[PDB]
């Protein structure tokens, strides 16, 4: 189809993703797709096919 | 179809995602899709197919 | 179909998602879809197919 | 069909999702769909198919 | 059909979802659908198919 | 003498003095002494002398 | 004498003095002494002498 | 004498003095003493002498 | 005498004095003393003498 | 006497004085003393003499 984005802005201030740790052991920021930051930010994804798998996991501990 | 986004703004201040830990052991921020931040932020996803699996899990501990 | 979003704003201040932990052991913020933040934020998802599975779980402990 | 959103605002201040823990052991914020935050925030999802499963669970402990 | 949302506001202040725990063991905030926050917030979902399952559970303990 | 102020606080939120006018003609907020705002706020004044005058007046219209 | 101020605070948020006018003609915020704002704010004044005058007036219109 | 101020703070956010006018004609914020803003803010003034005058006036219109 | 200020702070954010005008004619912020801003801000003034005059006025219109 | 200022800070962010005008005619920010901004900001003034005059005025219009 058609994806149409039109934007007029005088002033924009944007902070995307921040991970801050002090005296910490296991800290995970995990994003399955894309990370898009800005004034006027657009992300588009298309998957065409049978039996598609999208899997996102913080952490796995196995013993 | 048609996705149409039109936006007029004088001033915008945007903070997307923040993970902050002090003296912490296991901290997880987990996003299955995309992370989109801004003045005028758009995310679109299409999956075409039979038997599709989208799975998101914080953490798995197995023993 | 048609998704139409039109927005006029003078001033906007937006904070999306914050995870804050002090002296904590297991903290999980888990989002199955997308994280979209802004003045004028739009997220759209379409899944076309039989037997689709969307599963979101904080954490799993197995022993 | 048609989804039409039109919004005029002078000033907006928006806080989406906050998880705050002090001296805590297991804390879970779990969202099966998307997290959309802003002045003018729109989320739309369509699932077309027989036998679709949407399942959201805080946490599972099995032994 | 047609979903039409039109909104005029001078000033809006909005807080969506907050989970706060101090000295707590198991705390779960669990949302099966989407989390949408803002001045003018709209969420729409359509499921087309026989035998669809939507299941949301805080936590499961099995032994 | 002795003025002793001791204060322990975890979290404090303080708003001192606000004057808000819309479509208004003559609005006066008038404070003869000092304006002191905070977590732990202290104001002390000493006047030593004969025939001292402290006078505070909103407004004077003379014709 | 002795003025002793001792303060312990984890988190403090302080707003001192705000004057806000829209479509207004004459708006006056008038403080005879000092304006002191903070976490732990202290103001002290001493006047030593005979016949001292402290006078504070919003506005004067004379014709 | 002795003025003693001792302050321990983890996090402080302080806004001192704000004057905001839109479509306004005469707006006055007038402070006779000092303007002191911070985490730990202290203002001290001493006047030694006979016949001292401290006078603060928003505005004067004379015709 | 003795003025003693001792301050321990981890994080401080301080905004002193802001004057903001849009489409406005006469706007005055007037401070007779000093303007001191910071984490740990101190202002001290001493006047020694007979017949001292401290006068602060927003504005004067004379015809 | 003795003025003693001792300050320990990890992180400080300080904004002193801001004057912002759009489409405005007469805007005055007027400070009789000094303007001191910083992490650890100190201003001290001493006037020794009879008949001292300190006068601060926004603006004067005379015809």
From Swiss-Prot, chains A, B, C, D, E, F, G, H, I, J:
Impact upon substituting residue 18 to T: In PARK1; no effect on osmotic stress-induced phosphorylation; increases oligomerization
Tissue: Highly expressed in presynaptic terminals in the central nervous system. Expressed principally in brain.
Phenotypic consequence of residue 22 to K: Increases oligomerization
Disulfide bonds listed in the record: none
Sequence positions bearing Phosphoserine: 52
Protein residues bound to Cu cation: 15
Region annotation (4 X 11 AA tandem repeats of [EGS]-K-T-K-[EQ]-[GQ]-V-X(4)) ranges: 1-32
Ranges occupied by Sequence repeats: 7-21, 22-32
Effect annotated for changing residue 15 to Q: In PARK1; no effect on protein structure; no effect on phosphorylation of the protein; no effect on membrane- and lipid-binding; increases oligomerization; increases fibril formation; increases secretion of the protein; impairs copper-binding
Modification(s) after translation: Phosphorylated, predominantly on serine residues. Phosphorylation by CK1 appears to occur on residues distinct from the residue phosphorylated by other kinases.
Localization: Cytoplasm; Membrane; Nucleus; Synapse
Similarity comment: family membership: Belongs to the synuclein family.
Disease annotated for this entry: Genetic alterations of SNCA resulting in aberrant polymerization into fibrils, are associated with several neurodegenerative diseases (synucleinopathies). SNCA fibrillar aggregates represent the major non A-beta component of Alzheimer disease amyloid plaque, and a major component of Lewy body inclusions. They are also found within Lewy body (LB)-like intraneuronal inclusions, glial inclusions and axonal spheroids in neurodegeneration with brain iron accumulation type 1. Parkinson disease 1, autosomal dominant: A complex neurodegenerative disorder characterized by bradykinesia, resting tremor, muscular rigidity and postural instability. Additional features are characteristic postural abnormalities, dysautonomia, dystonic cramps, and dementia. The pathology of Parkinson disease involves the loss of dopaminergic neurons in the substantia nigra and the presence of Lewy bodies (intraneuronal accumulations of aggregated proteins), in surviving neurons in various areas of the brain.
UniProt note: domains: The 'non A-beta component of Alzheimer disease amyloid plaque' domain (NAC domain) is involved in fibrils formation. The middle hydrophobic region forms the core of the filaments. The C-terminus may regulate aggregation and determine the diameter of the filaments.
Function: Neuronal protein that plays several roles in synaptic activity such as regulation of synaptic vesicle trafficking and subsequent neurotransmitter release. Participates as a monomer in synaptic vesicle exocytosis by enhancing vesicle priming, fusion and dilation of exocytotic fusion pores. Mechanistically, acts by increasing local Ca(2+) release from microdomains which is essential for the enhancement of ATP-induced exocytosis.
Subunit structure as annotated in this protein's UniProt entry: Soluble monomer. Homotetramer. A dynamic intracellular population of tetramers and monomers coexists normally and the tetramer plays an essential role in maintaining homeostasis. Interacts with UCHL1. Interacts with phospholipase D and histones. Interacts (via N-terminus) with synphilin-1/SNCAIP; this interaction promotes formation of SNCA inclusions in the cytoplasm. Interacts with CALM1. Interacts with STXBP1; this interaction controls SNCA self-replicating aggregation. Interacts with SNARE components VAMP2 and SNAP25; these interactions allows SNARE complex assembly and integrity.
Protein name: Alpha-synuclein
